[PDB]
Amino acid sequence: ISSITNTLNATINGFPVNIELAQIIHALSRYHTPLKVKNGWMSMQPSFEDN
Amino acid sequence: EQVFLPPFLWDGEQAGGLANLTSLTFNWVLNNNLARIWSHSDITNDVSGNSTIGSMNISFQQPSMYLGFVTPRLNIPIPPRITYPYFKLSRYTTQFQNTLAPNASSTFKSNVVQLDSIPRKLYLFVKQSDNVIYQNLNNQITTPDVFLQINN
Amino acid sequence: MSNSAIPLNVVAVQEPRLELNNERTWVVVKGGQQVTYYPFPSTSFSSNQFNFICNPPSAQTVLDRLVFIQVPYDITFTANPSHAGITENLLQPGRDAFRAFPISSITNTLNATINGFPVNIELAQIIHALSRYHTPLKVKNGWMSMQPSFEDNYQSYRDADGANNNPLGVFTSAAGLSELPRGSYTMNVVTNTTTTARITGVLYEQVFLPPFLWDGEQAGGLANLTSLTFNWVLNNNLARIWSHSDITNDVSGNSTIGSMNISFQQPSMYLGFVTPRLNIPIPPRITYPYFKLSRYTTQFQNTLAPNASSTFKSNVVQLDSIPRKLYLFVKQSDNVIYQNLNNQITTPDVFLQINNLNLTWNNQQGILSGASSQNLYDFSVQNGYNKTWSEFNGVTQQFNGVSGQPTKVIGLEGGIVCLELGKDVGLRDDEAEGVIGNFNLQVQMTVTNTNQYVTVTPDMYIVAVYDGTLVISNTSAMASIGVASKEEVLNARITHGVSYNELQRIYG
Amino acid sequence: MSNSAIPLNVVAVQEPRLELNNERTWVVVKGGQQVTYYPFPSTSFSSNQFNFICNPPSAQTVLDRLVFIQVPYDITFTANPSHAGITENLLQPGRDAFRAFPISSITNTLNATINGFPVNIELAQIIHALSRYHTPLKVKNGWMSMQPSFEDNYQSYRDADGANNNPLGVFTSAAGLSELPRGSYTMNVVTNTTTTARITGVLYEQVFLPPFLWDGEQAGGLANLTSLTFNWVLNNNLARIWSHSDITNDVSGNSTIGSMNISFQQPSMYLGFVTPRLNIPIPPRITYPYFKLSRYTTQFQNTLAPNASSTFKSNVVQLDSIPRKLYLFVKQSDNVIYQNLNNQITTPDVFLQINNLNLTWNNQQGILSGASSQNLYDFSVQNGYNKTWSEFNGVTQQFNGVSGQPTKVIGLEGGIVCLELGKDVGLRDDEAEGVIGNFNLQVQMTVTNTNQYVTVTPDMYIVAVYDGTLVISNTSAMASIGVASKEEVLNARITHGVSYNELQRIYG
Amino acid sequence: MSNSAIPLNVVAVQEPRLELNNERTWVVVKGGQQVTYYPFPSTSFSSNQFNFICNPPSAQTVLDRLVFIQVPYDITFTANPSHAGITENLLQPGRDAFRAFPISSITNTLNATINGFPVNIELAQIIHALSRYHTPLKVKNGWMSMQPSFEDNYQSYRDADGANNNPLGVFTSAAGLSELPRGSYTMNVVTNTTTTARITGVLYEQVFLPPFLWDGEQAGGLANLTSLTFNWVLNNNLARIWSHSDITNDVSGNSTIGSMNISFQQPSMYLGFVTPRLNIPIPPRITYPYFKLSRYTTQFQNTLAPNASSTFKSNVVQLDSIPRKLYLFVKQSDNVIYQNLNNQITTPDVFLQINNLNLTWNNQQGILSGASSQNLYDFSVQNGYNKTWSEFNGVTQQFNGVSGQPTKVIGLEGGIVCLELGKDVGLRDDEAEGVIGNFNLQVQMTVTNTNQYVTVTPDMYIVAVYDGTLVISNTSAMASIGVASKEEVLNARITHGVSYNELQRIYG
Amino acid sequence: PNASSTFKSNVVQLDSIPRKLYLFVKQSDNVIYQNLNNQITTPDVFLQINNLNLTWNNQQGILSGASSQNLYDFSVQNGYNKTWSEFNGVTQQFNGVSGQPT
């Protein structure tokens, strides 16, 4: 889902905070999930990084 | 899929949740191709050129969102005003030419980018350019997301 | 004066020529010394993203409203195998120009943050509907002149040749003091032979999002910034930028032009800072108007043939405050137009003829269901629609003279109705364009495809526009929607001093 | 500021950018809930007149002032024996189209009755003169766009073809952002083959006559009232609706088309009734602006041609007050131009060019006896004439190439002058725009015919337009012309509050 | 309302259809008793210079500021020996007409004198850049219509032919409702045959001055003066009135037209006089805005063509008082293009395109230096440039189909940057548009040659305009510049009462 | 081969006034590195400066008015050691034989 997302904006208590998901995630994804945590919440979406 | 971006988390370890809020709202917006959802492997691609798949159609139905409100015990009171650690991430891309093939080297430099405070950390890498590979359902489906090898 | 049904009050004005008497006062216009322009070559500019980060030299300088980014570029075409030849040379005088407007129609998003607090438009879609809706031959020739700007009439370019009004025309063939067609832009052609072309130039796109203003009106500039930034991300496809025609392309669907490679060169934003003079001081805080615009779309999967009707139920949506206004139209659905290079350069973005629009607001339903197909046009021209009803209908006949051929019917374009929320919707008392919040809207609307040649698989849109103050203190950036309140909106004493036409004039 | 002959009072304004400090007031727009529309169909429509009895939904429900009607029609033609004709289809590609504006041009009279009290205008001959007069391109592309809207430039169709501004010419071939010629109008053509043709579609029209507004600006809608009614009593001819160029008919004028017949299907008016919100109350009785049109005419026996001079004398009349505006001109004679169908079809609107006009007010002679024609034009333009001087007094030479062909002159329509009877004529003291009455007038004016191939028996016209306030009440409607008593007109105290150019704005 | 950081005060506004009720007044409009017009046949006139003297009937009789003079003439062309060939007539249907504005571009210097005191405009060089500047489509179509009007857009006549908009074209071939080409104006031809041409008719042209106004917005009229005289003088060659094209003139040879000759009769000014009604008296002495325009020019003999830029610098000049604005431009040089008939007739009036400006001001250097040329445009349009960004900024490419032609480039005139002085320069504190005394400024900028056919030797101008008050009294004419005292200007009160864009209408 | 253009640099803040400062346009580095042929056979030289205008802090237009030849005058004074002819470099030698361009 997120590899298709352009941007994801959320606003909390009236003030906005945004990321840019499409670009960041694959690079952000390798840090810094120990094995235990790739089996953790990561588990819900497909997660095997393209080696 | 998990909502990413701080202060919302996606890791081992829990932390003290936001309160006291009055509002929240989560707007997505997804870039236009939607063919990047699926993958492919080009072994099955025809020998001369072409692919079996072209073309594909993607839907979505109303998507719910799941969150958990924990009210707290009357006796223990929670502060009127309170502070959370929040990070804020930014990207800067710069395409370079010419292309290198099939396995040769070159060097690249970037124009000075000036920031407003020392960042916590700074990632760097060299990805296969997006301007290419957004041609064709086929290319978009087949190609992997891995970077190029930094030799220095 | 009296001696009418109720006695009225007298006053007398003088003819223009007389009136030599009245108190005449010399006026000194003072504007703080040092109005100046700096350019900020974008850091980190790439096909996918532009990004400028600029800082005002000092506090106490007001930033002028009009901002724009000039982006020099490079395109290369190539002859597709192999319907061709293919004579004579891809590029023709009638057949191909920039789309209008070339850079903004390619931007997926324009995020831009003042003093820390982020603001953004979803430029890509919004622009083409919002271009028609404000401005008059006057503005058109003012600032809106810098990008290619003659917006498309004809339902498919193919037939459009060769006419005075055809949008991809040369500078010759455009009557004096009119919107010159899009081919009238200048980019040098380094080469155009058969089988290969390559052009080069520099094109300006002014950045749309409010507070920054495109319309020719001016107004206070937002001092006092401490930091500022602009960023755009561009829809990857990027072939859209060029607008081509079908007449040369021919019987087998296959197109002369496919394909092409666009590059860019490091562009610069160009914004300029007045710095006020020590005599007059400015306030420590201030408040500006701002308009968050946002779009919802529903995309259908049925398809109607050339000259055929149908209905489309909207798909529901919850809003946050009653918008200031709300436009509606149904377009050619991109989901299909994007696949294939030929199909995205040769298809013009023009809409579909709206027969009846019946929409639902805030629990009651069935508003306007009795209005004329044409009536929709009249309460929208009230808002400045600026295109004749003949073209809004829109369809055309043109009978031939010679035995004994059929006459050719031309699709011309579509209506895009917009109904101001207080004006033609009506809101139960205690409601006004500010006030929050939580209501719902769903537009059930019947339509007809006019275009002869292709099956338009359709789609809907609705571009809302909210009304909110934005307060800028240094350092802060509060933003609001719902400045008025429930007790506040009711029982607010009316003012005759203004001046209603005036409210139309401050556009957002 | 001081130091300048007599010392003057200094002020200083801020520049537009730097105008950052002043009081800002969030200004909430209220417009009562329930704007809704209705389509009353007319039982008792026929070939001879249309009738609409309809009524407001209730009292306390403001009727919106713009009102229009749409009618579906049906026409057939049939080729004329004998002609050394013809080839190869009757309806030609750019030679024929509706006279503009169509329905309102064939209406002998129109008559409305607001709340019992009848108001009526003479549509046939009052329209063409009034229409030229207050329409910037801005207003021309607004509401008027509905019914065919391009006025006749050329003195005779036969010359027009094929021009860039040819009045009756196809949609393609008119410049971008401008008035489309009348050939653009959408209608379904069943046939068009040689010897016959049959066309059919729906075509719009607006109600004219005040308080209903043809011009686009919008103001307080006239209500409360109990019953409303219209009667478009047409004229006997009906074949006049169509226009067709002389070019095709051959030898002695044997128009191919003769002869045609029309038809009609149930018509239908359209009005919109907003209802006001509960808090703010409307009053019991209010007072409206209110005009009245009237035309005096005189027929002459002699005839001048092809381009000889002459002169004419008005013919003494009385008017009950001094009217607000006057229009003057010498269009073609209606006694002729009706008999014989082909002739009736071909003749264009345009007037004979005015060379010198010298007029009588009451007991004042030669009110303007020494003004150059340029002088006459200038004031009409100041009033709002909206045509280039070269088109006024129209005669354009056009050089010829090739040895040795003589240079062919073109006729281009005459001028229609107007005096605004306070500013231009000059009124004697104590007497104002309103006051009644009994004043004498007659106008003598030298014209020159300019047409090339027809001999015109001229005819003079004057259109007086009175001002006055009408009080609509529940339920009886008073009216007045000349509300200001003679004395209250003199010794009224001038007000620099409002500018004159604001009054320029109010009426059509 | 009080929802923001600072509570901001509320007001409600009644939406336009429900504007009622509010107290309404009947307004009586009072013009002066007698309004008149008379021609003044120039009391003395000849070949190289003519003039009028036309005293007002009495003091106590206001006069219309809108003035104009009508001049009847005779031109006859002889066929030049011996350009080879010559078949086809001497005049062509699309290839020649009067240069616009015909009798203004002849005039060396207008000169009036109000009431014993002299005011003067040098008219020839000044008019072509001033005229670009303030006309929109309403105005270009009003009074400004009388003389041939259409400014010259194509950088070089020859290639213009034959576009719909071609500067010189006939009335047919102009778009419906828009500025018509120069060939539309009526001049009767007594004879046009190869070898010889003779043509004869009247032509109107206003007095362009201050006080007297050329734009419509009406303003108060000159009372109470005793003497008025106008003086004119013709810039020598005078063949310049006419225009032409290269296409007809033939290969490595000479034009066919040279030489011609001209001739006038007695031309007559046209003044209006309104004598005000007995009720309201006119004040003993009265004060009028009065702007005077200068020009400062520079020649540098060297040459560049067809397209390579260099820098030119303008000799430092002094001003007596910060002028209210100043224009800058480069253009073809006057010293050439005066010698030789061909050179005089067929070379259009247009400007090289400005690549970037870099003026200095007392002393500084460089204001406006670092702004993209693009940027000069969009800050000039703010003062009313009125020409598409592409018309400004010179050339536009154009490709053809057929292998292998070269792709033809077209030059089409470069803009003229104009900057208001408070608005865009910024003055050091306590100097404002009136203030005296001493300053000097030298603009220096770079410009690239646009057109393809000839080498352009250039020149550049600087037209400064001074704004002050003039006191027409009885009897005198003290004229004041430097109305605001410097200390005075420092501490003048700021009123939000009068909006700024309001002061953009006063012009002059 | 010999067109004229304009450029700019992103703003770059400094932490102090520097004693000296050197501006020059080089044949860009990135294009010379690829390829053996190119790396060896390209001399390291600069393009002729038609005009230089720069802005000191929050101040603009400096040195804009001075002729490019003036740039030389105050820089040789700094110690430039190279004939004006080579600065702004381009030279014309004409050959003497008919049917030949210089």
Side-chain angles (χ1 to χ4, degrees), chain C residues 71-73 75 96-98 102 145-149 169-171 180-190 199-204 242, chain E residues 353 374 388-399 407-413 448 450:
Chain C
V71 37
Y73 65 90
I75 334 288
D96 47 332
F98 278 22
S145 282
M146 46 189 74
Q147 334 79 36
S149 288
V170 233
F171 173 76
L180 14 140
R182 293 205 302 280
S184 196
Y185 223 57
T186 135
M187 32 43 193
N188 14 320
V189 96
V190 310
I199 81 108
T200 285
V202 39
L203 80 184
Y204 316 81
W242 191 268
Chain E
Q353 74 169 141
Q374 159 49 61
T388 343
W389 149 259
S390 209
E391 281 226 54
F392 182 126
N393 155 84
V395 18
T396 110
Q397 186 173 260
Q398 168 184 337
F399 31 130
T407 198
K408 78 185 320 286
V409 75
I410 306 300
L412 49 3
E413 87 93 282
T448 215
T450 22

Side-chain angles (χ1 to χ4, degrees), chain E residues 3-37:
Chain E
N3 247 71
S4 286
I6 1 42
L8 36 167
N9 219 350
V10 43
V11 267
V13 167
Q14 275 288 17
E15 235 219 16
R17 326 108 90 34
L18 300 132
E19 222 262 305
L20 81 303
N21 67 84
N22 49 196
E23 282 303 346
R24 37 200 42 164
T25 64
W26 169 281
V27 50
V28 151
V29 42
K30 301 221 274 292
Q33 58 202 52
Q34 233 268 252
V35 183
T36 199
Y37 295 106

Side-chain angles (χ1 to χ4, degrees), chain D residues 284-298:
Chain D
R285 107 217 228 97
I286 69 282
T287 166
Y288 289 96
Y290 153 85
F291 310 87
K292 175 174 179 64
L293 275 270
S294 35
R295 155 228 32 152
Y296 325 115
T297 141
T298 272

Side-chain angles (χ1 to χ4, degrees), chain B residues 47-63:
Chain B
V47 93
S48 165
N50 21 126
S51 161
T52 19
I53 254 44
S55 152
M56 67 185 275
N57 303 225
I58 298 81
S59 285
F60 284 111
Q61 336 294 197
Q62 201 131 126

Side-chain angles (χ1 to χ4, degrees), chain E residues 40 43 52-56 63 225 227-230 269 271 273:
Chain E
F40 294 111
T43 77
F52 320 66
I53 169 272
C54 49
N55 294 63
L63 154 144
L225 68 313
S227 336
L228 217 198
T229 88
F230 292 88
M269 204 82 61
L271 288 284
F273 304 101

Side-chain angles (χ1 to χ4, degrees), chain B residues 1-115:
Chain B
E1 218 261 320
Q2 305 180 55
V3 71
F4 285 104
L5 110 99
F8 302 112
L9 89 164
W10 65 94
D11 352 305
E13 147 221 324
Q14 274 271 2
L18 310 186
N20 19 227
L21 310 103
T22 133
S23 326
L24 270 161
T25 99
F26 297 66
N27 317 193
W28 266 263
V29 42
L30 328 190
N31 278 136
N32 206 211
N33 299 304
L34 271 302
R36 217 67 192 330
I37 285 286
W38 199 235
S39 174
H40 215 71
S41 98
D42 219 76
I43 187 266
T44 152
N45 259 29
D46 97 45
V47 93
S48 165
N50 21 126
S51 161
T52 19
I53 254 44
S55 152
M56 67 185 275
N57 303 225
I58 298 81
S59 285
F60 284 111
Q61 336 294 197
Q62 201 131 126
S64 275
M65 179 153 131
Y66 281 93
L67 38 164
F69 315 102
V70 191
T71 137
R73 278 180 194 165
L74 330 67
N75 66 146
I76 259 67
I78 131 93
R81 83 193 342 287
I82 218 313
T83 158
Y84 302 91
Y86 106 103
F87 311 129
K88 194 265 175 284
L89 332 193
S90 146
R91 61 108 166 192
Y92 298 90
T93 95
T94 333
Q95 92 293 134
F96 275 107
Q97 55 184 316
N98 283 173
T99 41
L100 61 233
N103 61 311
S105 178
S106 77
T107 187
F108 297 143
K109 173 134 196 197
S110 133
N111 298 77
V112 190
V113 358
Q114 46 157 275
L115 341 109

Side-chain angles (χ1 to χ4, degrees), chain E residues 206-219:
Chain E
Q206 33 215 340
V207 176
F208 287 38
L209 246 43
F212 313 1
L213 38 87
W214 49 108
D215 182 6
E217 355 212 26
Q218 254 323 353

